[PDB]
Amino acid sequence: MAVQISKKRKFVADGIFKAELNEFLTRELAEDGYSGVEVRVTPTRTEIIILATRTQNVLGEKGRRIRELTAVVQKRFGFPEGSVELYAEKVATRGLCAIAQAESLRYKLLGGLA
Amino acid sequence: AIHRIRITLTSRNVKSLEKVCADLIRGAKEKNLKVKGPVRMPTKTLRITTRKTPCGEGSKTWDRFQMRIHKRLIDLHSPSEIVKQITSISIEPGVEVEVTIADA
Amino acid sequence: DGFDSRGKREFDRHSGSDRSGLKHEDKRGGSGSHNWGTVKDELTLDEWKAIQNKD
Amino acid sequence: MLMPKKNRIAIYELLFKEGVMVAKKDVHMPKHPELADKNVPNLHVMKAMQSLKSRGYVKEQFAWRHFYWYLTNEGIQYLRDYLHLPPEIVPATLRRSR
Amino acid sequence: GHQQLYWSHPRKFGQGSRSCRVCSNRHGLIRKYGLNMCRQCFRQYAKDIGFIKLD
Amino acid sequence: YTTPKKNKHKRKKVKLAVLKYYKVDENGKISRLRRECPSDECGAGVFMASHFDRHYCGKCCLTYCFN
RNA sequence: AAGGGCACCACCAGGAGUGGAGCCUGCGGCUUAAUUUGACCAACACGGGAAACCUCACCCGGCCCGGACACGGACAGGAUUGACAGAUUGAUAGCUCUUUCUCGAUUCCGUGGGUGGUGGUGCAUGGCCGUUCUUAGUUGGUGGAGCGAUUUGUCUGGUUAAUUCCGAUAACGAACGAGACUCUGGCAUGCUAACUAGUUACGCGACCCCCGAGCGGUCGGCGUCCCCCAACUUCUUAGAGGGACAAGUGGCGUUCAGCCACCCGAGAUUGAGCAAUAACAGGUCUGUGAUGCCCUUAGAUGUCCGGGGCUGCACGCGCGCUACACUGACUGGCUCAGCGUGUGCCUACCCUACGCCGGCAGGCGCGGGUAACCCGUUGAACCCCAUUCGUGAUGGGGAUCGGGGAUUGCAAUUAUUCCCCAUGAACGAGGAAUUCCCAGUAAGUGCGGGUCAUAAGCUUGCGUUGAUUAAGUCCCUGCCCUUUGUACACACCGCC
Ligand SMILES: [Mg+2]
């Protein structure tokens, strides 16, 4: 209807949100081996899962970093207060994750290993 | 009460869309609600043709990106109420629901 | 004089840099830290305000 | 920077109310989306956050077209003694219900 | 200069009004389906968005 | 380069001393030798200019010319 | 250098053309204040590059700091910020000049230090893309040959679209690429279904009927999920399953791999996507908050604003559009599509029905549609059927140019686009040369998307009508493999 946007634009915009959120999380949590983001969207709330190598690092002291990120992703995307939840999940078999191994390789080469 | 609900399912991947429709019909049939057959709306193909090169030099090759949107309609028409009978929707990521009353 | 009128060079293989050429020559056989490897290498404010304006 | 004190205090109190700060990279945007009641401009908020980052009280991240300033522990006490607060008032990132 | 001429240009349309939602570039804009993304940034992010090459 | 115009001169303020443009008399009687700006946001504090032919509010930019 | 193999970016046999003419557009050149710039099979309607402003990077000018932070000064007896009037300026830029107000530690000055840049270098780089090459090529393990580097495997031959297979065989067993795969098209009167698709049947109508047809004919007329008030999925949609495998027969072949033809069949080769080891100092720093170094950084190469330019014309070239006519042009009538889009975070801008005004371009009200719900049964063009013209640069062509009228935009001049009335240029099938192509193909022919406030002679798709020739070869042009020669190995753009 009039307020609602068409299905085509809605799905394109949802993909846009996925891409931007993934890029921001990549840049922010790159030094913690951020593998990827999986977003479960319900019409009531939005649940997002940061698949990372080090959950103990992506969530800070007492979860400070994860709640800080939750506030950040509220502010950017205009999500209403208390309508989005950020979870952090350890990636299974990280050796099989192409992004994680590339990040560890970047860390090694920055350190100065041959 | 007399109530009739139209639920529309919209997604990108047919496997999960078919699963999330089939379990809805299968669940409601056990609860003895008159379910009209899942209507398959024609799929919407968003097609974007873009130059492969990021510069301009080349043999003028194009990429045909395709985004397919699949839409299903399910109608539950019970003589009694429907909201109290159906309170779970059993969603998986990617699929989006939209509740509608038959008045609309 | 190595270029034509437009500015493209008439001998693309003939390297114009004295430091390096077509082939990649490896510094010290790929030794040192920041280098390719070698065989050896391979092997709350709101409530505070609410009480501030209270009095 | 010719930023008035009302704008400065409003931006600082937002930064301390929530330990995050998001703003589009648009110098010509008339008002910040948040606290637009103060009629501060996005240029002012960008430059205030840039000056905060320069002395190191905040860390800056950039998405496609948005900044993501995160308040630091060094900035906590600077905001405390700039706004004349006891060491009890904290951002929600520091404390939620505890 | 001052307020009355710094951004006084009418920019309600044209190339100058629209910009890349990613890299703030004004060339190759894809406005279909409300993408507002660059010709190159779209090739970068198409997989994330959901556009798949089928044919 | 070599612009035909010579470099523009930026304006420098006069670094004017204390205002004191209202005097007292016989042990202190208030007398505003200047004019007052009547605007409500301007308030009773601020003062009008004293140009040779007009009166100008420094904030509200209201003008009152005598002809 | 020799021998093999392959290919409509090679030919043959053809088709349609291009190069001949006009014009659009892109390069070079000339000119210019600037006419920004990249690129020279694999650049030249390419940078999604159809630039009025913006874009903009160039030129002619004028504002602004959006020069963080540190140190030291100056400073509430003012560091400093703006501004009415006049000049001054294009400017209603307090930009400056006279001028007095106003602003209150945010600034200002100096010294260090930033930062930005469509500035340079693609011959410093990443990523991405193009090409060699979509050719058929590439590599382990074990075993054999070797003192080694290595070689065999990976081959005389047949066969294939394909080192695809079969065979020979010091090799055997594999892997990548090819294939397989995914998508798309072709068939299911078989399954699941559908008031956002409908179809039959039936009921009310509306008309031709009356000779009377009467279960007569037409109806995109109204209805029968107006949910109690029919069924069904054939047509439509979209899911799962099927179906095709050289499977059957004859012939050829080592009688192997396979090849040819025919039957039954919807189909006996539907198109794409993906795509190896590598190489190209190929292209992009003007896609980027990708990026090293250099350059500039307050009279800016930052950024903004005004105007101009990107179009500029003795000339050359490339992709194209329209024509040269009667197989036609004009006028009228009849009659048929499929892709696909459609109201916006920012963002200002949607598709349009219906009625009314005007001749047209358009204008004014009144809706519908965030969409199989409305445009829309997309009444498209070509074509078909009738009229006139009549071999005449002619009723072909509509280039050039005059006048007028509308629309978008802040702004239409160097004419944005559109409409109307006028002049009517070359052009009578195009030299040397040269491009593309094998079946729903070429070609004719229109319609969508992208660009877009206005914009298609471009591009990307779709549909309609719909062929001639060929089922071959290495002649030309190339590429690949083997043998061979090598003083090359940064590898012939070599060495000397
Ligand atoms: Mg005329």
From Swiss-Prot, chain A:
Record note on what altering T42A does: Abolishes phosphorylation by MAPK and translocation to the nucleus following exposure of cells to hydrogen peroxide. No effect on phosphorylation by CDK1 or PRKCD
Give the consequence of mutating T70A.
No effect on phosphorylation by PRKCD. Abolishes phosphorylation by PKB
Chain segments annotated as transmembrane? none
Substitution effect: K18R: No effect on sumoylation. Abolishes sumoylation
Location of Asymmetric dimethylarginine modifications: R64, R65, R67
Specify the domain of life of the species encoding this protein.
Answer: Eukaryota
All residue ranges annotated as the KH type-2 domain in the record: 21-92
User: Residues involved in crosslink (Glycyl lysine isopeptide (Lys-Gly) (interchain with G-Cter in ubiquitin))?
Assistant: K90
What modifications does the entry list under PTM / processing?
A: Methylation by PRMT1 is required for import into the nucleolus and for ribosome assembly.
Protein location = Cytoplasm; Nucleus; Nucleus, Nucleolus; Mitochondrion inner membrane
Q: Which residues carry this modification: N6-acetyllysine?
A: K62
In the record, Phosphoserine modifications are located at: S6, S35, S104
As stated in the Swiss-Prot or TrEMBL entry, residues carrying the post-translational modification Phosphothreonine are T42, T70
Locate the N-acetylalanine modifications and list their residues: A2
Q: How does it assemble?
A: Component of the 40S small ribosomal subunit. Identified in a IGF2BP1-dependent mRNP granule complex containing untranslated mRNAs. Interacts with HNRPD. Interacts with PRMT1; the interaction methylates RPS3. Interacts with SUMO1; the interaction sumoylates RPS3. Interacts with UBC9. Interacts with CDK1; the interaction phosphorylates RPS3. Interacts with PRKCD; the interaction phosphorylates RPS3. Interacts with PKB/AKT; the interaction phosphorylates RPS3.
* Similarity-based family: Belongs to the universal ribosomal protein uS3 family.
The name on file for this protein is: Small ribosomal subunit protein uS3
**Which source organism?**
Homo sapiens
Classification from the root reads: Eukaryota, Metazoa, Chordata, Craniata, Vertebrata
| Gene from which this protein is expressed | RPS3
UniProtKB/Swiss-Prot annotation, chain B:
In the UniProt record, what gene is named as encoding this protein? RPS20
Q: Which family does it belong to?
A: Belongs to the universal ribosomal protein uS10 family.
List the GO biological process terms.
cytoplasmic translation; positive regulation of signal transduction by p53 class mediator; translation
Q: What is this protein called?
A: Small ribosomal subunit protein uS10
Name positions with the PTM Phosphoserine: S78
Report the NCBIfam families cross-referenced here.
uS10_euk_arch
User: Mind telling me which Pfam families this protein's record contains?
Assistant: Ribosomal_S10 (PF00338)
Q: Which UniProt keywords apply?
A: Acetylation, Cytoplasm, Isopeptide bond, Phosphoprotein, Ribonucleoprotein, Ribosomal protein, Ubl conjugation
Q: Which residues carry this modification: N6-acetyllysine?
A: K19, K60
Please give the GO cellular component terms listed in this UniProt entry: cytoplasm; cytosol; cytosolic ribosome; cytosolic small ribosomal subunit; extracellular exosome; membrane; nucleoplasm; synapse
Q: Which SMART domains match?
A: Ribosomal_S10 (SM01403)
**Which species expresses this protein natively?**
Homo sapiens (Human)
Could you tell me where this protein is found in the cell?
Cytoplasm
Record's subunit section: Component of the 40S small ribosomal subunit.
InterPro entries, alphabetized: Ribosomal_uS10 (IPR001848), Ribosomal_uS10_CS (IPR018268), Ribosomal_uS10_dom (IPR027486), Ribosomal_uS10_dom_sf (IPR036838), Ribosomal_uS10_euk/arc (IPR005729)
Gene Ontology MF annotations: MDM2/MDM4 family protein binding; RNA binding; structural constituent of ribosome; ubiquitin ligase inhibitor activity
* Keyword Ion transport applies: no
Changes after translation: Polyubiquitinated by ZNF598 via 'Lys-63'-linked ubiquitin chains when a ribosome has stalled, initiating the ribosome quality control (RQC) pathway to degrade the potentially detrimental aberrant nascent polypeptide. Deubiquitinated by OTUD3 and USP21, antagonizing ZNF598 activity.
From Swiss-Prot, chain C:
So which tissues is this one expressed in? Expressed at high level in the heart, skeletal muscle and kidney, and at low levels in placenta, liver and brain.
Instruction: Spell out which residues are annotated as carrying Phosphothreonine.
Output: T38
The signal peptide, as residue positions, is none
> Could you tell me where this protein is found in the cell?
Cytoplasm; Nucleus; Cytoplasm, Perinuclear region
Q: Where is the composition biased (Basic and acidic residues)?
A: 1-17
Chain positions found as N6-acetyllysine: K23
Q: List cystine links.
A: none
- List Phosphoserine occurrences by residue: S15, S17, S20, S33
Annotated positions of the Omega-N-methylarginine modification: R6, R28
Cross-linked residues for Glycyl lysine isopeptide (Lys-Gly) (interchain with G-Cter in SUMO2) are K23, K40
Q: How is it modified after translation?
A: Phosphorylation by MTOR inhibits SERBP1 and relieves ribosome hibernation.
Q: How does it assemble?
A: Associates with mature 80S ribosomes. Interacts with EEF2/eEF2; interaction sequesters EEF2/eEF2 at the A-site of the ribosome, thereby blocking the interaction sites of the mRNA-tRNA complex, promoting ribosome stabilization and hibernation. Interacts with SPIN1. Interacts with CHD3 and TDRD3. Interacts with ZDHHC17 (via ANK repeats).
Q: Which family does it belong to?
A: Belongs to the SERBP1-HABP4 family.
Task: Kindly provide the name given to this protein in its UniProt entry.
Answer: SERPINE1 mRNA-binding protein 1
Q: Which organism is it from?
A: Homo sapiens (Human)
Curated annotation (Swiss-Prot), chain E:
Annotated PANTHER family: 40S RIBOSOMAL PROTEIN S29, SMALL RIBOSOMAL SUBUNIT PROTEIN US14
Cofactor(s), names only, from the UniProt record: Zn(2+)
Residues modified as Phosphoserine are S8
What residues bind Zn(2+), as annotated? C20, C23, C38, C41
State the similarity comment. Belongs to the universal ribosomal protein uS14 family.
Give the UniProt subcellular location, in the record's own words. Cytoplasm, Cytosol; Cytoplasm; Rough endoplasmic reticulum
User: Where does this chain mainly localize?
Assistant: cytoplasm
Q: What is this protein called?
A: Small ribosomal subunit protein uS14
A Pfam family annotated for this chain is: Ribosomal_S14
Q: What is the effect of changing I30F?
A: In DBA13; results in reduced protein expression; results in pre-rRNA processing defect
Keywords from UniProt, A to Z, are: Acetylation, Cytoplasm, Diamond-Blackfan anemia, Disease variant, Endoplasmic reticulum, Metal-binding, Methylation, Phosphoprotein, Ribonucleoprotein, Ribosomal protein, Zinc
Locate the Omega-N-methylarginine modifications and list their residues.
Answer: R11
